[PDB]
Amino acid sequence: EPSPYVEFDRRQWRALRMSTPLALTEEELVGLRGLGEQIDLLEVEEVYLPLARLIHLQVAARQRLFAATAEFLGEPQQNPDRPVPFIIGVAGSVAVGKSTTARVLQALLARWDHHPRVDLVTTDGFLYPNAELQRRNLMHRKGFPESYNRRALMRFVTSVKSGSDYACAPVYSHLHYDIIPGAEQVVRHPDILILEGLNVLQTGPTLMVSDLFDFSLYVDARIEDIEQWYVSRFLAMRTTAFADPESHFHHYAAFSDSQAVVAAREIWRTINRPNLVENILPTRPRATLVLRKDADHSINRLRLRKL
Amino acid sequence: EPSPYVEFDRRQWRALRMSTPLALTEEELVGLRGLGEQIDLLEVEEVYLPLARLIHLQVAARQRLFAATAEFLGEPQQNPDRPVPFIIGVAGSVAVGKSTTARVLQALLARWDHHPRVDLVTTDGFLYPNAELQRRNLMHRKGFPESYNRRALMRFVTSVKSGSDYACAPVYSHLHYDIIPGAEQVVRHPDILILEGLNVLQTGPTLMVSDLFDFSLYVDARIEDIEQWYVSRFLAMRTTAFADPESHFHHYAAFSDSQAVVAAREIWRTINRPNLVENILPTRPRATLVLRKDADHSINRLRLRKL
Numbered sequence: 273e274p275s276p277y278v279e280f281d282r283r284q285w286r287a288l289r290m291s292t293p294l295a296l297t298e299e300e301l302v303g304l305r306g307l308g309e310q311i312d313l314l315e316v317e318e319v320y321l322p323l324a325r326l327i328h329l330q331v332a333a334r335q336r337l338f339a340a341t342a343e344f345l346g347e348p349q350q351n352p353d354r355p356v357p358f359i360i361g362v363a364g365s366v367a368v369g370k371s372t373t374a375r376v377l378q379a380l381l382a383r384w385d386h387h388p389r390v391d392l393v394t395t396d397g398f399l400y401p402n403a404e405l406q407r408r409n410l411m412h413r414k415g416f417p418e419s420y421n422r423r424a425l426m427r428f429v430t431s432v433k434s435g436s437d438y439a440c441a442p443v444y445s446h447l448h449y450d451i452i453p454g455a456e457q458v459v460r461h462p463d464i465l466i467l468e469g470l471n472v473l474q475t476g477p478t479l480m481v482s483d484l485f486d487f488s489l490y491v492d493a494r495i496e497d498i499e500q501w502y503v504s505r506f507l508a509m510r511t512t513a514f515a516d517p518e519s520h521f522h523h524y525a526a527f528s529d530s531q532a533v534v535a536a537r538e539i540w541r542t543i544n545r546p547n548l549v550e551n552i553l554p555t556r557p558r559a560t561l562v563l564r565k566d567a568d569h570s571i572n573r574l575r576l577r578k579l
Numbered sequence: 580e581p582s583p584y585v586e587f588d589r590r591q592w593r594a595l596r597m598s599t600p601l602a603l604t605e606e607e608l609v610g611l612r613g614l615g616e617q618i619d620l621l622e623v624e625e626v627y628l629p630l631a632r633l634i635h636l637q638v639a640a641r642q643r644l645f646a647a648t649a650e651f652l653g654e655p656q657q658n659p660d661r662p663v664p665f666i667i668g669v670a671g672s673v674a675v676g677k678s679t680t681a682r683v684l685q686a687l688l689a690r691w692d693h694h695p696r697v698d699l700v701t702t703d704g705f706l707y708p709n710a711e712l713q714r715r716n717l718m719h720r721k722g723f724p725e726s727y728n729r730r731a732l733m734r735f736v737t738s739v740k741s742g743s744d745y746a747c748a749p750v751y752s753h754l755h756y757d758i759i760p761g762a763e764q765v766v767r768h769p770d771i772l773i774l775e776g777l778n779v780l781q782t783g784p785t786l787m788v789s790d791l792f793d794f795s796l797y798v799d800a801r802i803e804d805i806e807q808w809y810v811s812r813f814l815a816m817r818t819t820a821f822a823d824p825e826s827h828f829h830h831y832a833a834f835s836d837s838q839a840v841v842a843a844r845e846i847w848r849t850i851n852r853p854n855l856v857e858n859i860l861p862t863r864p865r866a867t868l869v870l871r872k873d874a875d876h877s878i879n880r881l882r883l884r885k886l
């Protein structure tokens with residue numbers, strides 16, 4: 273029975289690296305790695321390099337589709353210094369390492385021969401501010417689709433891919449756990465734009481940012497492993513993020529291992545796990561490429577959409 | 580404010596015809612026109628010709644995307660006699676003329692220089708048989724998403740676009756209003772496949788046929804106009820389709836105008852209108868091109884997705 277997908281073990285995927293250069297050192301990789309992630313240079317060569325290759329191939333191909341529609345339209349033939357921004361979506365659960373995935377990806381692509389402008393934007397800045405969330409009774413639903421200003425987000429991406437000189441996104445503060453008044457992230461006609469979020473692959477009764485993605489990535493892992501990574505991260509943050517007196521969750525720092533685990537599980541069970549099962553996972557079927565992470569965090573299986 | 584869409588009046592769209600040949604006569608056009616449709620050769624030149632042009636441009640462009648993924652994969656470079664079938668989805672409400680639209684489209688594309696194999700398949704054959712619908716209490720829901728064997732339909736399209744030598748679809752009988760035992764429609768690696776249906780543009784928690792569309796068409800019109808066209812068609816069929824003694828609805832033939840109108844409105848209000856409003860219309864935002872039909876049935880406005 274035919275399928276729109278084709279599986280790959282790390283062995284078969286790495287082969288597709290061909291002669292792709294590794295323009296990243298250990299120090300740099302470290303500056304991209306997130307707390308808990310085990311990503312090393314080897315994984316960057318066997319997994320992220322074939323990926324950067326596939327993407328640069330598609331960035332060329334996909335360039336025709338916009339050219340053809342330009343020809344048909346009798347429009348002047350597209351300006352070289354301003355191509356149509358290639359949009360890459362990176363989705364997945366909280367604590368699955370998708371942000372490291374996104375950061376690494378940004379680093380690699382930025383280091384491609386002609387050095388393309390490659391921006392990275394997370395959906396955090398599109399979260400409604402706490403005051404607005406309380407108003408909507410969503411202070412315990414940060415992460416769910418309804419906790420974001422989806423129109424604003426769609427506006428942003430639409431603006432960047434339609435060729436605007438600049439588009440701005442609000443900025444979120446994890447330290448203060450809320451939108452930062454007046455903060456803007458400015459994106460200026462990048463060549464590649466990576467949008468990272470939880471449900472960015474969602475589809476619906478209106479055109480959404482997923483309909484604008486030229487390529488999508490979904491960082492996947494067994495649910496029980498993700499919970500472990502989540503709890504583990506929570507405990508570790510008692511001495512990093514929560515240690516800061518300025519942290520909204522500074523009082524989590526004095527928790528004991530037991531208390532920490534209990535609190536992390538509650539948060540996971542009441543927010544993150546439901547959001548993963550009801551909203552995030554249902555979108556995995558449409559991802560161009562799925563990166564499967566084993567319990568040890570390593571990518572040992574990939575799924576690609578050939579259709 | 581930027582947009583993923585660009586509007587067109589008949590005047591601006593026809594200009595895009597360029598030097599496209601009209602390989603269709605009146606007799607032929609007639610043999611494609613449905614009861615109630617006002618389509619003439621002029622509309623075929625001003626609306627369907629620019630469309631056939633745009634499509635053949637995209638069929639070339641879109642060919643790269645599959646080539647690039649073939650290159651990346653180190654796969655042998657695609658066989659010329661067997662390209663990747665281009666999939667066109669045609670959606671819209673019952674009685675909006677989308678089938679005529681599909682038939683005309685098939686005729687034009689089949690008449691393109693190198694004469695490509697262009698098949699047309701409606702989703703009717705994927706409807707569950709009456710016995711199965713009764714079992715599910717859906718005998719008054721033919722047309723709704725749940726009245727079709729969506730897995731089968733997805734299997735069919737997946738098979739055709741994955742390059743199978745042949746794929747078969749069940750056949751529906753409008754005369755007998757049910758699936759025809761043993762009837763199969765065989766599709767053999769066509770170059771272009773047009774899938775026509777009511778909710779074929781729907782998206783969901785699994786990869787669906789809309790995710791495989793390389794181009795989609797949505798035939799639109801004001802809801803009140805569609806109801807008129809629907810009722811009008813119902814009355815006219817008292818002397819065509821319902822006139823046949825073998826017709827499942829043969830007893831509608833003896834209805835008076837008044838009785839006919841009452842019955843048609845009930846059917847429209849209880850089945851077709853709800854299905855249009857809850858399921859069909861919500862999918863319009865993703866259509867590549869929307870053909871707007873005025874009350875007189877003429878296409879005087881078009882909406883194209885540039886993003």
Ligand SMILES: Nc1ncnc2c1ncn2[C@@H]1O[C@H](COP(=O)(O)OP(=O)(O)CP(=O)(O)O)[C@@H](O)[C@H]1O
Nearest residue numbers: 306307309365366367368369370371372373446513
């Ligand atoms: N609770 C938090 N505190 C501080 N920074 C956070 C954060 N959650 C996310 N971030 C930012 O996003 C990055 C995510 O890195 P990583 O890929 O290792 O985890 P993740 O994004 O898969 C799970 P998360 O939903 O917690 O971000 C963090 O390194 C930091 O840059």
Ligand SMILES: Nc1ncnc2c1ncn2[C@@H]1O[C@H](COP(=O)(O)OP(=O)(O)CP(=O)(O)O)[C@@H](O)[C@H]1O
Nearest residue numbers: 613614616672673674675676677678679680753820
């Ligand atoms: N009730 C019916 N009786 C006979 N044929 C029908 C039919 N409904 C659909 N068909 C077939 O599909 C064609 C549809 O033609 P047209 O484009 O004019 O209407 P339509 O498809 O937009 C509304 P419908 O949902 O009734 O098919 C009919 O001409 C016939 O070939």
Ligand SMILES: CC(C)(CO)[C@@H](O)C(=O)NCCC(=O)O
Nearest residue numbers: 366367502503505506507509539
């Ligand atoms: C689980 C950690 C430490 C890491 O993901 C972090 O996401 C966290 O605890 N944040 C505050 C509670 C929450 O995750 O909603």
Ligand SMILES: CC(C)(CO)[C@@H](O)C(=O)NCCC(=O)O
Nearest residue numbers: 673674809810812813814816846
């Ligand atoms: C309205 C007509 C005549 C034409 O669409 C036809 O669709 C019809 O009446 N069919 C049987 C009832 C129904 O439309 O469900």
Ligand code: NA
Nearest residue numbers: 391458459460
């Ligand atoms: Na920038």
Ligand code: NA
Nearest residue numbers: 579790791792
């Ligand atoms: Na496809």
Ligand code: NA
Nearest residue numbers: 698765766767
């Ligand atoms: Na055929």
Ligand code: NA
Nearest residue numbers: 483484485886
């Ligand atoms: Na697009």
